[PDB]
């Protein structure tokens, strides 16, 4: 670990500076170093970890989609042969993306999830496990595609089970988990009806619980509810 | 637009 | 060179794919590999090289400015002591930025400039040399600051001399060179009057030559003229 | 706004 000589608190401080500078690769490396100190992460620290890697992998995924679309067009009839370069470069980006997902999944397995006992931390990390297996599924084409998809499903399902038992229906982690598991159903698992049902039930149960919230909590929950509503409008 | 994840 | 085993044409093809995917670090590495093949660059290839590195160094410069501003605030009176982390991270970004500038300047010195005989290539590369010494000057604070500034000035001046002898006043390279040398005067060399005079003379001489241009060339030249006008409006 | 370079 190249961050092994830096203090935990300094890694966290630098992760926050990296966020301000929009240096998300640095942010992710600082937060990886902080995780590898072996202590559990606070709520704020968990969100720094997720923001960092979401931005890194988000850029890789967008690049992969651009290259995959060019590669698909090259394989249409009447397309001029251009050589192996598009496939090679798409593969290079794909391998880098898979490496980042494997890094995140490795941090969760060694040893964030096994030490996470509170609902807020455990659900958060299981959502992350589902998300990063989902990103692996987006690029999978081979013999393990079904197992990758089932790994994402299983992680999301455990997170859902805990969130429904331990969290109110307006909790932003619960809402964001449902948002993403719904998208998993729609576009990974070929289950658009399940995706729509999950988004609708999640939205409706949150609606009914808004009356219990402070103004600030209401703002937090309604923001994610609007994402669920947007997806429902797109899909129906 | 495109679907949201978070 | 990690690109040493890839064909020149494949490096160029991948640089264009990297641009489409907004993967500017990859784009720069592909174009560095293409330069190191030892052949001169076409006009299109020169612009791929410059676009790649301008995006890479542009992100580093923006991050450096964010961190430098935080560091300056930390040193104001009444600011709480936070340790060495802000300075350390600003220094890390600074060293990376200087490394990219040194890489570009090394490509120009070995051996792009010495083989560039046509006005369009020679002016283009000398503008690049001035630009990358200017980016070094932005972060310089020590005994070599004056020599770094003079290296930028000297490169820009040679480019200006060639451009005035060999290019029409509407040529987009000549215009962009003048735009940047004017900014050098304003914010590096503490010469705002020289900056304003250069921008005004450049704009006025281009104006008078627009009548010679096709519609497409007119569009190319007037776009850069508007940048000169914008700077003049900001500065007066 | 900020000054332009290219
Ligand atoms: Mg310690
Ligand atoms: Mg054909
Ligand atoms: Mg592959
Ligand atoms: Mg615990
Ligand atoms: Mg060859
Ligand atoms: Mg105080
Ligand atoms: Mg330094
Ligand atoms: Mg020559």
Residue numbers in the entry:
A (entry chain A), C (entry chain A): -4 to 231
B (entry chain B), D (entry chain B): 546 to 551
The authors write:
14-3-3 proteins interact with many phosphorylated proteins, with differing affinities and cellular concentrations. Drugging the hub protein 14-3-3 raises the challenge of selectivity, given that 14-3-3 binds several hundred phosphoprotein partners. Inspired by chemical crosslinking and reversible covalent fragment-based drug discovery, we developed an approach that we term “molecular locks” to rapidly access molecular glue-like tool compounds. These dual-covalent small molecules reversibly react with a nucleophilic amino acid on each of the partner proteins to dynamically crosslink the protein complex.
Importantly, clients PKR and RND3, each containing a +1 Cys, were included in the panel. To mechanistically understand the differences in affinity profiles of 5 and 10, we investigated the structural changes between ERRγ, PKR, and RND3 binding to 14-3-3 via protein cocrystallography. The PKR phosphopeptide bound 14-3-3 via a sequence with a C-terminal cysteine. The cysteine occupied two conformations, with both conformers of the carboxylic terminus forming an electrostatic interaction with Lys122 of 14-3-3σ. This positioned both conformations of the cysteine side chain into a small amphipathic subpocket of 14-3-3σ. The positioning of the thiol side chain and the electrostatic interaction made the +1 Cys and Lys122 of 14-3-3 inaccessible for molecular lock crosslinking. In contrast to binding to ERRγ, fragments 1, 5, and 10 showed no stabilization of the PKR complex. The highest-affinity peptide, PKR (KD = 180 nM), occupied 61% of the total 14-3-3 population, while the low-affinity peptide p65 (KD = 260 μM) occupied only 0.1% of the total 14-3-3 population.
